[model samples]
Target chain A: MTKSRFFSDVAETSSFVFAVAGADDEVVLETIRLALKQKLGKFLLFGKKEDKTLTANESVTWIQTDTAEAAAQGAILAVKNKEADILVKGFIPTATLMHHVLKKENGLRTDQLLSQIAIFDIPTYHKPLLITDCAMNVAPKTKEKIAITENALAVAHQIGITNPKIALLSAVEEVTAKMPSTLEAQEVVQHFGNQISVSGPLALDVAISKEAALHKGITDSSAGEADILIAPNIETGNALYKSLVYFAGAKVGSAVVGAKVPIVISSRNDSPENKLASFILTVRLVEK
Target chain B: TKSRFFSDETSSFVFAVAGADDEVVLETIRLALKQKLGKFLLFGKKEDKTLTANESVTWIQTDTAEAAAQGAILAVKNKEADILVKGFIPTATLMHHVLKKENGLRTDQLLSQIAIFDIPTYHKPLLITDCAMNVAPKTKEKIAITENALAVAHQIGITNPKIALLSAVEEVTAKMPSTLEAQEVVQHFGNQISVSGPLALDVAISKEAALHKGITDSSAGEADILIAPNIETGNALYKSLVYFAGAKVGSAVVGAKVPIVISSRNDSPENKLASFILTVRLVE
Candidate 1:
């Protein structure tokens, strides 16, 4: 689907409940206000103190807390109790917020690995690209990488993409023992050979640029025009995301998926449009 | 009349190229000549039809690519040339002579590639290190890589460069080995240079982001150099800036007797010229 269609479809859908933890920062509040302006969802703000502007809204609830951890606990419990449709992280350390979200007692855990997916609309690229495990799953093993890829595929489907092309990114296109990412990529391709349209052991340039694939003489079916890119590790994913955002002027929306409820973790680096996009993506993940 | 090493235009360095039979290499040389950037000494079995008549260009015939590689290295060692350029030969072949014991180019420091980019969004020239040279470098190797980048920064009029060790996150978590190594690198350069580690890309470049994240380090906002945690991150960032951001980049393999220019096969003639200009900036 086109970028406009993605936005219009989500806007037409019913609103979902969003429980935001530590919503004290203006950056986070501004994002929430953007979502509220579209009438996309009602918000439960969990913070030490309530903001005056959002308190008057009938759809917004101010949940007062004394500390950031308390705010995180409140938001997670709201999601676990089905009081909220999605969990949003605001102005808190990711590790601290994740510590509560990952607890088994929270009952949000799923068989699938919890990973982060960043969807970017690069100005230079033709369509939106989804990259996985940029923030969460720091050093995933082969099995974990498979689960991460699955999480990204699910997000791709939610964004109106079926039969998505996947590229397992690495430094080189060939399988070599020296680079474990390549070997693991080869394993991933073999595991999903008949089931999915995926290619692996592809360099960054070859994965996105058809010209690069042609120059390297790579004839893989999924060489260029990849819909989903699975990073070898967090460093690769993180740097690729930042390069696209800072250098290429890409608009991005990222969320932590593979849970009972989707989680939107906003960093200060995220633009207002990106934060809104994250909300739109999370709302789309919620079924009607 | 020039005050800085980079501003001195009266002198131009000699570039000794191995396997200079390729058209791209000749075009790069011609472009460099137009800018009056450098002179050239070509080592190959075939001479380009364009530069044979130029007084500033010299040709030395060699039967094999290996011989050409050796002649180019020896030219720099013998003070006949100031820099080495890899042309038509494979990088492994050219790097073999550069690492040889008798070549006089190999130093105790490990060789690393430092790419200087003129990004449109960035405020200054940004340097990304070890993009093409080192693979997954350990903490010790990263130190050498950062040192190699510092050498280039020092020569280009940035004496006290602010460096940010690139990682997934700013916090040092053991789960991500890159973050731990970044912390170690930060400790190694305690107050020696303006260096910070475990910095994400946004905090490294965007002052607003740094303040938002509560990162108050001197290098947090105005980082001049970025030390990539691994080869994958480095290479991806380089490619993204070039292909997506339309950033113009010039890179060289440092930590040797002199800078070695090994432009990628797909590099444009303009990029090749920039690489030569980078080498010129590094020369005495």
Candidate 2:
């Protein structure tokens, strides 16, 4: 089935089960608790044993753990043990949580590279655009970028875009020896030539406007109307992602995949409404 | 303030000579005369003088169109006329004879067109260069174009003009030759001259766009002058700004001894008069 159809079907029915790791922070717990009350998801909070009283009156189920690390482990264990379909990081550090997920013994393994996928609703943009590896993967190599592309492709599939147009973004459009990212983007496109419809080393305008592509005489299938943008590194991706949010007044949500279950890793900075929206999106993805 | 041409008088002034004649030229002359923006120099035909005798206007019957162009050129060249308003004869015909080597108003500079615009979409007026005169300018010609535009901007009270070398994209990509030329021009400005760009049109005008793209240069968002890569880019953008963006424009030919008004046939009379008024300010 198409990713949109799958998401829509999930959105229509099924309250997805989410295990919130390191939910000791009151703000994070309150956000998730409020989101859960809005039918975004069915939450099970795992936090410090001392913080058990934090959720006493809350409707969310609690699983007490000693520390943040143990809470993350407990949340992953819930997903592994089939008690939950999604794992969410509430107040835990990403590296600490990733360590538990990558552990060979009891980690969430799926034989695919893990990557972060962000969906942005920008006011200036005509539609929602996806960015990959914005929050993770500092300096991904060419092969790692390909893996990131595939991970983004999987998310695009879940989101309902079949035959997604992927734009490998760089400072300039041409492949120059000086700019390693341009050459790497070109290499990635050639490597995935027949497997997917991809365009590389395109500027932001050409990736978004067909008129700009035609003006530049670029004929790639994804020259314009790109569904996903694969940034060269974390710096460029992070700068662009935040620029779209803070400058362009864009709304954003992120999900982590390539695990046994979808993960909703909302940061503390994310608004309560944003946390709720991410919960809804993760719930829908889990149901699918 | 440089009193090179600008006047302190708020009211408009005109020039009136004894003899010059050409009906179509007289029509523009009479129009300028009626508006108190130009004084006539009648030098040739007495019969044509009767054609526009009303309203206390002055006329001089000049020998011919060549002499008329020469007369106007000499007036501005000698500081007698504020602006040289073209009429009746073809611009090429008038310019060819007026731009001669000896006893002509040649200043050892390449002539180029400068169009000033009060674009509705923008907060202030914008200046676009080489829209009508220079065709397919290369790197060297672009420098001449930039210099000519800078001279005009300097005359119009804008010192240290922020020039934007407009292109399809902001960066210098090898695939786009214009981008390379734009980069070279911007580098020339940075090292040898003072200007900014290899800037896209949007980034040149919009601060938000420049900030979003992380462009830190001073002129990225505040370009006072826009230098297009070629004639097509300039002409297309000029026409689009006027026709599509609903802009009011005033055009004058620079690199001449005086600012010359050269309006097209399709241009409205109000536009022609706006160009005339702008030239008046330039030559005052």
Candidate 3:
């Protein structure tokens, strides 16, 4: 199905976004408000005691707590109790917010590796693209890159990119000792032959520009058109993630995937359009 | 009066073009030859009638691309050719023979790619390096690659080129290790050239953008050479300029025994012609 049809066909039941210390951050509120307006979901605001409440809408509930840690704990309880379908990080530090759910004693902590996926809709590119580990994995090794690719694939499937053309981001499209990323990309491609359309060492040019692939004599399945871009490290991943938003004028939505519930993490620097896009994108990724 | 590269003389340097039956590739050579640059040693099945000038062109009998690549590299090693051009053959074919360590034409240094652009918006021609070669080079190798590029810029009459070491962000962060390497290149080479890095593409070019980023360096908004952190970024920058911005680019494989022209089939005759000119400058 065309991406244009992906949204219209999305069978949605209202999902909950439990915000942790969310009252102060307008960006977070903006995401929640857009979601509510779009009929994608509702927000359960967890903030300090002095935080203003959202009164008119029965869908949104504002719970005022004394400390930020307590607010996270409360959100964790909400998720555990099936009161919320997604977790949103607001004013608090990401580490502080993540530490609670990652605790071994915390039921919310899963064995899966938590990953970040920066989804984009670029004008020059066709369809939605998902780039992973831009904000999470520092420098994933062969084993970790493979596992990360798998986790990213799961999220891709969830977002309706059932058979994604996942291109492992590298400086070149061939395997050489000078770059370890190329070797791992070849490994991942071999490991998932036919099951997944994986290509590697694909410089950003080849991954996104079909003309470049043709020009360079690269005829791989994922050449010039990648549904997902798996960065070798955070630098390339983060650089590309931001470059798409900043340079290419792409509409983007970011989420830390592989969590018990998809964690919506929008940057304050992001456009309201991007933050809203991310919220609805998260809503699409979360359980129905 | 300031530059020595513009002199119109038929130098003694010999050029070898593999798979040389291609008409378009020869047209580019013709343009360079119009300036009395050099003679040609063609490696193909037979010589073209149009290029039959006995003194300027010599045809080597090679039926296939593989054979042509072997012949071209041997000519360079034998001191019969000063430059190698890819004529109607994949770059890999030519690179395979060039990279063969035992008998082929390889120095101990890594083979690197350099792309030069005549950008409409920029103040002068800009050069980028390691765009197609030296993928994720070691700090030491990155330094070598940069010097190799600088040598090309120096060859083309730009001495003391300001180089901007590109990275994702403007500052060094622990998560982005490439930035730290960019920092290392910056600090290590501060005395040698006009350089500063860990710069996004913006700060390196636009004075206005640098002011916004609080980046106050001579290289900021006044860069002559851009050292890409990796081949991907370099290629992305190259393609973005060529495809998105409509800039004219010419790139060649530098650090080879002789300059190796590796233009893609999709490249216009004009672009390939530009690369041919860049290759000629590498000689002598």
Candidate 4:
């Protein structure tokens, strides 16, 4: 299962329960329906009481809430109480729900910094390319970036990439004192150099294209074959993720990791296909 | 009929090529000349044999790269050339001449790089600003960059272009300063152009995303120009489209007395020629 080539190829026999906050929207409901159909999970939906489609499902337990905020609490507490295996965001604004999750009392917060991790099947690239900190971490310093990278490394390990080639993305391939990203990339490489397959200060072109790396005389082992790319900042990661989806026609499944459980914070813009992929990937992570 | 961007033109625009000894720039010039788009005014320490000595081509003898840059700047300043192009000369050398008050090319407004990409999936040619210039721009600098992009859009017959200020998220939060700056620019350009922002890359381009995200701005989906928050985002966006999606780009430095072409060393001949065409369109 860890060696699955595509998200659709991933399957699990063990049933994992998902606690969804504000599962009222059609997007969330449809995803739940599809996920349930796959026998991947039993769902505890906290938001509405009157959805006929959800009421029909014996596996789905609907927990009624007066407001979206209350629904968020219900879901979070479910995960904290071990009533749910995974925490999922449904219709609530990310910031609002995150405020609850990040609270000290929530117990969802971990020592590791929460980061967005995405696995992509890019049409132009060879294998599954994972990118991190795309949707979180505004401008991580050397210390914070290391934490973010570790979170992604855990996800990579869960997906059976024990010795994945990690690339710390920068605007330029060369290590320069002027570019802070390059400096940080070098630091990250040194920190993990003895333990893992990691390289850094690689440009986007050099990171993905062997021909481009050869063109620019880049000899880094991770060049053009990075299994995971840790973005320098939020702007670069966010834009790179969108570019792959919009421009490159890449299929992606992403989730926010480093929490007590994997958080499926699907955006309104996410396709049903992508949302399902995220569920499949998260289930794989939860499975023993 | 709406004039298509990057279509064949009949303008007699002449490019002032600083350090025209390089084959890359010469090949682009040859392509432009072959297409009958413009003539060339070459200034270089050495001339390439590849460029034909024809009626449309005029080469000026120079002693050094400094002289070449100075000659090209003067040619544009003196109204002898329509556009100024950087050939083998360093960007700093050409920019030194361009910024000099004595050369008369410097404007009160900021000079920024604008790239026009004909993406494979996009419906029309999209223009992005300050990708190669303006490292970490403040609100004021972003305003200037926005105006520079608008200037080119207006020149290319896009009278009311929709501009999207790029950011990680649409919501204005204190954590992400790009969103706040984007809002400031939108208010500054209020009712002037169809502009909106702190739009994420998806909401800026995808109508489906816009509808799903509940973004009601008119420029949410059909943005003609994207104002990137910082150089890193802009540079990454430009490179991603080019490398991953096979996007063809034409870029130039605008907000000068004349448009300036600063093609990268790695730019293909087609891209360099497209830059020439893009700059020529801005010529009055």
Candidate 5:
């Protein structure tokens, strides 16, 4: 299924069940409540003993644990045990939850550099844009960048972007030594451009807009409608992500990919709507 | 007086204008003739005496634009004129003579484009280069072009001019080729210049923009020179300055025995004249 321009491309087939690592927070309750209303998914709440966020129901399964560590480890186990289809972080640090995930015995381990992808529904833009590695691989090298690209590509494919067009974002189009990102992009494309429809060392404007591509005389098929943007580094990627959200009022669905399955490390900073969108986007990742 | 060309800026250098049949080119040369900033040796198919007869003295009658271009280059090569200005000749024709090895004015240096912008909002005149020539220059090429631009800076009395190697992001990242390549280039300047880069255009020009981005450095928002990574970026900035910013601009081709004024037909009369005077100052 080829993906459409927005979230409507992903329909509901009973949203994937999510295992909440720590579910005591109001934000988590609100997010699951709203998502359940839309038939998005149910949550398996692993919270502190004697604290019940929800009573027993098909939509909500409450499990009591000793501490933050126990709650997170138990959630990952639930996913590995097929008790849930996804894992969600709540009321705990990302590093803490990931420590349990990284354990060899955890059973949810992968020998890959963990990376993240954020999908945006920009109103003025032609279609949904997927930006990658905004939260992981701090200063990615050419090889790591390829890994990141593949991570985003996998997510893109899951969301119905079968033959995704990718743009490795950089400051300019040409490979000059001054900006190694351009050279890295060139190397990346040289290594990977043929496998999928990909081009690189493109500026922000040229990557997303047909008008901008024509103005710059860059005539790549992906110039106007890039399905995936492999950002140069975390700073550039995060800037693009936050800038779109803050300045443009864009709706976003974000998750950490390149692991056993899509992991939701929802921050307190993320709006409830954004968290819900992230959950729904993950649903598409697993559902299809 | 002409010996102090850019410093004293005496209005005295003589230039040879090839194929001056274009009315726009003629009008610009006529204005320079009026200003007495330089003398002219007009070579063209036209036999007009009104602009040249009273001012610079000699007019070479050439039937073809190519012949006019050859004649003008010959005059500059033989030291008969201090400058060569392209009038109606196609750039290929003029460049053919300028680069013709045996009889050509080949100085064995990398020829680069130097554009001077006297923007109303800028604190001082900004010099940028290699925009029109040298596409996708490597590391050494950028160094050569930077040195060439810096030479122009010295002539304009700007010692220790701050040059920003313009790029998409300021930090050196392997993902963006230009940033660390920018660092590599910045390292070579040992007190001969003050340069910083891998900077975006906003950080190079507007301090408030730099401040908002949290960049606090000399070259950030305070650059006297901008060395572009390639022709696209340089040309993009050139057009943006002319079209959007409404700035007065001038350009000259440097790194030859003499400065060559290759004025485009797209250039306004004022910009054309500015190029002519810019070459006059480039005359050593």
Candidate 6:
């Protein structure tokens, strides 16, 4: 499915609850305020009682906490207790929030792998492309890569791509003993051939253009028409994700999935519109 | 760094020109004959047609375009001609008859065009492939195109040619599928052969551009072959080399049983002769 439809779905379904941890940060509050004005979702702001006043917009419901760590803990608790449908990390450090979420008890813990999905709409492209694990899963093994694939598959399914053409990215396409990623990509394709459409370890060109793949005499179901890209590691994924945004004039929205609830984690550098878009995405996934 | 493909003697090569009736064709043949670059079996409508040549040449008369094309292919197929040179015949008419399945010069290989340019903006020569053949090929066909281009480079005496699969950007994004395909092609080459890219055109050909982006692949700065993503890219690059860079070109069609020199009608006589010389060198 296209990203415009994904956005439309989010905009149409707006009743999901979003818990914003460390919601006292001015940037986060302003973003949440914009979402509230847009009627994007129901926001539950968690922070110190004094800091809660930072959100000048009184439209949001405030859940007071003692500190940043407490705010993150409260946010997770809200998700675990079914009080919220999604979680948003505002000013809290990602490591601190991840610590609370991964706890054995009183956390939204699941056996499934957690990953980040970043959607981009570049000016030159025809549609939004989704990149995964850009902010998580560094150097995942074959099993972890499979879990990563499943996690991305869930996202794709949610966005309406029942059979996503997944391209496994690597330094090269051929399986070499020295490059573990290429071997792993090949193995994953073999194992998941029936479960989902997979291609690669393809270089960039073969995954995107049929002509380029034809030139190389590479014939595969997913050759040159990939929907999702399974990056070798965080380094390549992260660098590529950021480069698209910085150099390519791309509109980006980031989300974390694989928990009971989807989470929209906004960084300081993220604009208000991006945070709102993430909130909208969370609302759609929660409704689904 | 290695030995040249041929010895530095002009008389070591020979070529056969078909449909050599027009003034441009005859003039190009005459120049090559004068330089001792090659001998020619000039087949045209008139055997007694007077054409200035430094050395005595074999002149065969073929009354029609079909016979001229058939004679040219027969010469190459019979090992009588080192290279086939098309002169005054229409390219479509010649290719249509030459590429027949039965009693034709067809091989179990893809036929593609390679355009070489010595651009002033670049430090060395550049090779662009599939400019004149294969319109909007699928992913599978692009691989064959790449292989065909690599074969041409090998034939031109380049061992371990650095190939750049050109796209709009270096990074592989889901939105720009070409960028993803470019990356896949680069990876395929890296796994099975030695090459680099999914690189942009600037980074593939220029060390400074690659360095500016912190690209460190050995082939990133000095790629010998540039594989365009589509016909438009290839055409634009070819024209840009001629119009913007003021470059000289020597092109041929490979992947056939023999290298074919099918110069454009707009090409100068000198360029046509250069293409013939290139074909002779490659065929030898």
Query: Which candidate tops DockQ?
Result: 1
lDDT (Cα, 0-100) at A148 in candidate 4: 84
Better of 4 and 6 by DockQ: 4
| Distance from true location, Cα of A116 in model 3, Å | 1.7
- lDDT score of residue B149 within candidate 1: 85
In model 4, which runs have C-alpha deviations exceeding 4 angstroms? A1-5, A9-14, A50-52, A65-70, A81-83, A93-97, A103-106, A173-183, A194-200, B1-4, B7-10, B44-46, B60-65
Pairs with steric clashes in candidate 4: none
C-alpha local distance difference test of each model: 0.85, 0.67, 0.74, 0.84, 0.76, 0.69
lDDT tens string, model 6, B116-188?
7665445555677766566454456667788987887787777777787766457687755666667777766
Which runs in model 6 stand beyond 4 Å of their true positions? A1-5, A8-13, A49-59, B1-284
Interface RMSD in Å per candidate, to 1 decimal? 1.1, 12.8, 3.9, 1.4, 9.3, 13.2
Ten-residue stretch with the least lDDT total in model 1 chain B: B1-10
What interface RMSD does candidate 1 have? 1.1
* Model 1 spans with C-alpha error above 4 angstroms: A1-13, A62-74, A80-83, A91-97, A103-106, A219-221, B1-12
Residues B221-244 of candidate 3 have per-residue lDDT tens digits of 777888888766676667656653
CAPRI verdict (incorrect, acceptable, medium, high) for model 1: medium
TM-score of model 6's chain A:
0.90
Return the TM-score for each candidate structure. 0.91, 0.51, 0.75, 0.90, 0.54, 0.52
Q: Name the candidate that leads on lDDT.
A: 1
Candidate 5: tens digits of C-alpha lDDT, residues A94-173: 77898888775778867777787899886556578898876666678899999898888888888887899998887567
Better of 2 and 5 by DockQ: 5
Where does model 5 sit among the CAPRI classes?
A: incorrect
DockQ of candidate 6 is 0.03
Against the hidden true structure, what lDDT does model 6 obtain? 0.69
Cα lDDT tens digits, model 6, A154-215, are 88888777778888876456687766777888987887867778876876556655655765
Stretches of candidate 2 exceeding 4 Å from the true structure: A1-13, A49-59, B1-284
TM-score, cand. 1: 0.91
Query: Model 2, A1-288: lDDT tens per residue?
Result: 212211121323345678888777665777665664455656688876435454554446888777788888888888888888888886778768888787656768766777777787655556668888766665677998999998888877876777888988764566767667778999999989778889887666567767667655776656768888887765446545544543355567778777777787765445565565566566656655
Worst 10 residues of 2 chain B by lDDT: B1-10
Model 1: fnat (fraction of native contacts): 0.70
Model 6 chain B: lowest-lDDT 10 consecutive positions: B1-10
lDDT of 1 by residue, A123-193 (tens): 78888889987888887868999999889888888768988899998877878888898899989888887
For residue A73, model 2's alpha carbon misses the true position, in angstroms, by 1.6
